[PDB]
Amino acid sequence: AKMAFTLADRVTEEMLADKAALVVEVVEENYHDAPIVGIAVVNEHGRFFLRPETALADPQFVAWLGDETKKKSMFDSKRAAVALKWKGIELCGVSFDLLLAAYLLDPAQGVDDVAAAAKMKQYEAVRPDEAVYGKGAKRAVPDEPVLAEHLVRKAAAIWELERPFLDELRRNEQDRLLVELEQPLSSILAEMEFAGVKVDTKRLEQMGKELAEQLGTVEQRIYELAGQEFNINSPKQLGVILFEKLQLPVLKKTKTGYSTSADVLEKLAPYHEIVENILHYRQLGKLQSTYIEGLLKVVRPDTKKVHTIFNQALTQTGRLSSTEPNLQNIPIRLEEGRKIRQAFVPSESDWLIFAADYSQIELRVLAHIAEDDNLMEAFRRDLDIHTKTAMDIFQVSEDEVTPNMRRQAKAVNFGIVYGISDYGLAQNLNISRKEAAEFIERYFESFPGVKRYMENIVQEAKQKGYVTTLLHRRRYLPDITSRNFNVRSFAERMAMNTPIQGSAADIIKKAMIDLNARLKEERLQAHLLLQVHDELILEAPKEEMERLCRLVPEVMEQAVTLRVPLKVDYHYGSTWYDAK
DNA sequence: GCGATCACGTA
DNA sequence: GTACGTGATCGCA
Ligand SMILES: OC[C@H]1O[C@@](CO)(O[C@H]2O[C@H](CO)[C@@H](O)[C@H](O)[C@H]2O)[C@@H](O)[C@@H]1O
Ligand SMILES: OC[C@H]1O[C@@](CO)(O[C@H]2O[C@H](CO)[C@@H](O)[C@H](O)[C@H]2O)[C@@H](O)[C@@H]1O
Ligand SMILES: [Mg+2]
């Protein structure tokens, strides 16, 4: 049942039609400066397989690749685009990306290869990449006959599937979402990943030595307090010391033993001095292993830059994820960890890091979607939302709001966005269900619009089978009808949260597209480096800071128009840490 | 070599 | 109670 195709030894005119399914295969998971093992082109004239050495050296082919008028349909065009950027070749004219199309149609499918997307439309004349390349150690590029066959079948699948996918996207009112949001963003993410972020490796290594020193001290202190040595990083060995040798109370159990999570340890601190030391060890050890050593392992030795890969088709809510390294979870909450950011520096001398972040975008989005009068007014007055919530749920004036009252109102606001639950709020604020329930009840009394939204959105998820975001992203919630309380409740929380987190994702994605257009129009050298859900990190000549101070916030604030204003704070400095 | 567990970093 | 990714340990191949 082999598929017919030409194993070309040279590029020909018919291979450069103005519309084609293109496969520029990069097998290495991390495509940065990675090899392109083969190329397949399927168009009106037939199916072709070209060896990369040949194709990429052919002037006509490279010109075809960069010609925006020559339209290409692909799967994960960003992967190809970045791999090509590393070879100094521009990819343009990608009008359809099956990966992104599949992702928008149903994020839950976990589509990560052409075969998975094709299976959505009962097309199975293509093999899963894992079947062809294997995984782990067994992973390898098969001989040309097998490789060529696979790439051609993928291009053929893309060629056949474009119409049906676009048709369904259109029915879902997601056609613009793909064409005007995700696909253009893909090119922006490609530029960001390729540009990378410069790392001050000397600073990291210095912090590592200081940490190693402190860690040794705390480590020895722990052995001294426990009366023996053991693997502190072993929750099993640690559990024996804590709950057996030291007789500390067992307040929380895990699935396979005693729990030793930070939340549990905090409660045990009053009983033994060893606890605070374990907590300190946990903090320093996390920085050392994950942010000092982990980061140093992925820094390109030549450029000293880290090139993350933003997975644009993974999260169930529309957010991006970041890997190798993850640049969306660099420490900031605790000062010791926050200093890690001093290692992220501008890529050129006399340039600076500029960071802009939305202030409470999720709650502003909630105010908009729920049309809660009280909540919308609060933002229209740009009030401290946590103090305002405390004032309302505890019924007091601003001056009567104590720090603990704001702390709890803050916790309530988080729960509301995540899918409020008396049990959940209880565990978080360490109080009884009855108490937590009363807080939630008080919240809804003050924000009836939000209560109505939470009730209505769950009902809608059940009626339609899914929930949507501001820009029409969708997430199916089949569990919304489960007769199992736990399974159903999780789906209900997703119904409440997805439109919020998802709409916030839509907004910043459009902001990125709008920003890049503005930067180009102004011919600024400034460029995006990272996106961390509700913030954009750029770098630019120190001479562009004043213009960026006005331009970036405005573009982000004007990405979409809501019933409440969007507010963006911004800072800049010599390092990411200093952009505060 | 792999993957389940537990842990913890972010918004 | 939302959404993620990475690393140390550990027991089975
Ligand atoms: O290229 C990113 C794109 O590829 C997928 C598979 O189609 O993920 C692959 O590449 C990621 C980046 O290296 C890895 O984290 C992942 O494990 C690997 O399968 C998509 O999920 C993603 O959108
Ligand atoms: O008591 C109604 C109240 O319960 C929630 C869960 O907190 O939903 C339950 O009741 C609905 C009927 O009104 C069902 O459709 C739903 O499946 C069930 O879990 C809230 O959404 C609702 O306001
Ligand atoms: Mg913020």
A546: Cβ–Cβ under 8 A, 6 or more apart, which residues? none
The verdict on A401 and A319 lying in the same domain is no
Euclidean distance between CA atoms A580 and A567, whole angstroms: 16
- Give the H or E element holding residue A530: strand A527-531
Q: How far apart are the first and last CA of chain A?
A: 61
Helix, strand and coil in chain A, % to nearest 5: 55, 15, 30
Euclidean distance between CA atoms A411 and A495, whole angstroms: 20
The finding on whether A488 has its CB within 6 A of some atom of ligand 2 is yes
**CB A59 within 8 Å of CB A111:** no
Euclidean distance between CA atoms A277 and A217, whole angstroms: 10
The verdict on A71 and A163 lying in the same domain is yes
Nearest ligand for residue A332 CA: 3
Q: How many residues does chain A have?
A: 580
Buried b (16+ CB within 10 A) or exposed e, A315-330: bbbbbbebeebebbeb
The verdict on A165 and A203 lying in the same domain is no
Euclidean distance between CA atoms A515 and A538, whole angstroms: 11
In this structure, which amino acid lies at residue A146?
V
Number of structural domains in chain A: 4
Q: Which two tokens stand for residue A444?
A: 């809804």
Q: Alpha carbon of A169 to those of A106, A154, A368: distances in Å?
A: 10, 21, 26
- Give the H or E element holding residue A379: helix A373-380
Pocket mutation for ligand 1, best pick of A32, A75, A76, A97 (most atoms within 8 Å of C-beta): A76
Q: Alpha carbon of A535 to those of A102, A157, A504: distances in Å?
A: 26, 37, 11
**CB A46 within 8 Å of CB A15:** no
The verdict on A183 and A243 lying in the same domain is no
A106: Cβ–Cβ under 8 A, 6 or more apart, which residues? A120, A476
Q: Which two tokens stand for residue A56?
A: 């990429």
Q: Torsions phi, psi of A129, nearest 5? A: -55, -40
The verdict on A217 and A333 lying in the same domain is no
**CB A331 within 8 Å of CB A287:** yes
DSSP A473-485: -EEE-GGGG-SSH
Give the burial class of A462: count Cβ atoms within 10 A of its Cβ; 0-12 exposed, 13-18 middle, 19 or more buried. middle
The verdict on A96 and A110 lying in the same domain is yes
The verdict on A128 and A271 lying in the same domain is no
For the domain that residue A120 is a member of, what is the CATH number? Answer: 3.30.420.10
Residue position matching structure tokens 């952009």 = A579
For the domain that residue A279 is a member of, what is the CATH number? Answer: 1.20.1060.10
Euclidean distance between CA atoms A567 and A384, whole angstroms: 13
Q: Torsions phi, psi of A572, nearest 5? A: -150, 155
Instruction: Name the residue closest to B7, CA to C1'.
Output: A261
Instruction: Name the residue closest to C4, CA to C1'.
Output: A321
Nearest ligand for residue A453 CA: 2
Give the burial class of A169: count Cβ atoms within 10 A of its Cβ; 0-12 exposed, 13-18 middle, 19 or more buried. buried
DSSP A36-79: --EEEEEETTEEEEE-HHHHTT-HHHHHHHH-TTSEEEESSHHH
Closest nucleotide C1' to the C-alpha of A255: B5
The verdict on A88 and A108 lying in the same domain is yes
User: What residue's CA is closest to ligand 2, atom 11?
Assistant: A459
Q: Which two tokens stand for residue A90?
A: 């521009």
Euclidean distance between CA atoms A513 and A403, whole angstroms: 40
What 3 state SS string does A239-268 have? HHHHHHHCCCCCCCECCCCECCCHHHHHHH
- Backbone conformation region of residue A481, classed left if phi is above 0, alpha if psi is from -120 to 50, else beta: alpha
Distinct helix (H) and strand (E) counts, chain A: 24, 17
Euclidean distance between CA atoms A25 and A11, whole angstroms: 17
For the domain that residue A322 is a member of, what is the CATH number? Answer: 3.30.70.370
The verdict on A67 and A189 lying in the same domain is yes
Instruction: Print the domain residue range for A490.
Output: 361-504
Three-state DSSP class for residue A570 = strand
User: What residue's CA is closest to ligand 1, atom 9?
Assistant: A29
Q: Which atom of ligand 2 is nearest to the CA of A458?
A: 21
Distance A569 CA to ligand 3 centre (A): 8
**CB A35 within 8 Å of CB A26:** yes
Give chain A's largest Cα–Cα span: 80
Euclidean distance between CA atoms A493 and A461, whole angstroms: 11
Q: What is the DSSP letter of A282?
A: H
The verdict on A243 and A140 lying in the same domain is no
Q: Which of A194, A223, A242 is the last residue of a domain?
A: A194
How far, rounded to the nearest angstrom, does the alpha carbon of residue A333 sit from its chain's CA centroid? 19
Query: How many CB atoms neighbour CB A570 within 10 A?
Result: 18
Pocket mutation for ligand 1, best pick of A31, A114, A311, A314 (most atoms within 8 Å of C-beta): A311
Say if residue A235 is preceded by a cis peptide, omega within 30 of 0: no
Query: Please, what is the angle between helix A98-105 and helix A144-171, to 10°?
Result: 40
Closest nucleotide C1' to the C-alpha of A490: C1
- Cα angle, residue A226 at apex, residues A222 and A229 outer, rounded to 5°: 75
**CB A142 within 8 Å of CB A134:** no
Query: How many CB atoms neighbour CB A380 within 10 A?
Result: 12
Q: Which two tokens stand for residue A438?
A: 């009363």
In this structure, which amino acid lies at residue A74?
M
Decide the pairing of beta strands A351-358 and A535-541: antiparallel
Distance A458 CA to ligand 2 centre (A): 8
A305-306 β-sheet, strand order = A305-306, A197-199, A344-345
Q: Which of A483, A504, A525 is the last residue of a domain?
A: A504
The verdict on A386 and A492 lying in the same domain is yes
Three-state DSSP class for residue A397 = coil
Instruction: Name the residue closest to B8, CA to C1'.
Output: A286
The verdict on A410 and A519 lying in the same domain is no
Residues with CB under 6 A from ligand 1: A 29-30, 76, 79, 112-113, 309, 311-314, 323
The finding on whether A456 has its CB within 6 A of some atom of ligand 2 is no
Protein-strand B interface by C-beta, 7 A: A 135-138, 235, 254-257, 259-263, 265, 279, 282-283, 286, 290, 326, 328-334, 337-338, 532-535
Decide the pairing of beta strands A19-25 and A71-74: parallel
Of the candidates A230, A152, A182, A85, the one whose C-alpha atom is nearest the C-alpha of residue A506 is A182
**CB A570 within 8 Å of CB A534:** no
- Give the H or E element holding residue A535: strand A535-541
**CB A99 within 8 Å of CB A75:** yes
Q: How many CA atoms lie within 13 A of A22 on its CB side?
A: 32
Euclidean distance between CA atoms A195 and A2, whole angstroms: 41
A305: Cβ–Cβ under 8 A, 6 or more apart, which residues? A196, A197, A198, A199, A299, A347
Decide the pairing of beta strands A351-358 and A466-468: unpaired
Euclidean distance between CA atoms A149 and A38, whole angstroms: 11
**CB A384 within 8 Å of CB A405:** no
Closest nucleotide C1' to the C-alpha of A107: C3
Euclidean distance between CA atoms A121 and A113, whole angstroms: 14
Pocket mutation for ligand 2, best pick of A420, A422, A454, A458 (most atoms within 8 Å of C-beta): A458
Euclidean distance between CA atoms A352 and A573, whole angstroms: 6
Of the candidates A364, A322, A324, the one whose C-alpha atom is nearest the C-alpha of residue A532 is A322
Instruction: Name the residue closest to C9, CA to C1'.
Output: A234
Of the candidates A156, A160, A110, the one whose C-alpha atom is nearest the C-alpha of residue A130 is A110
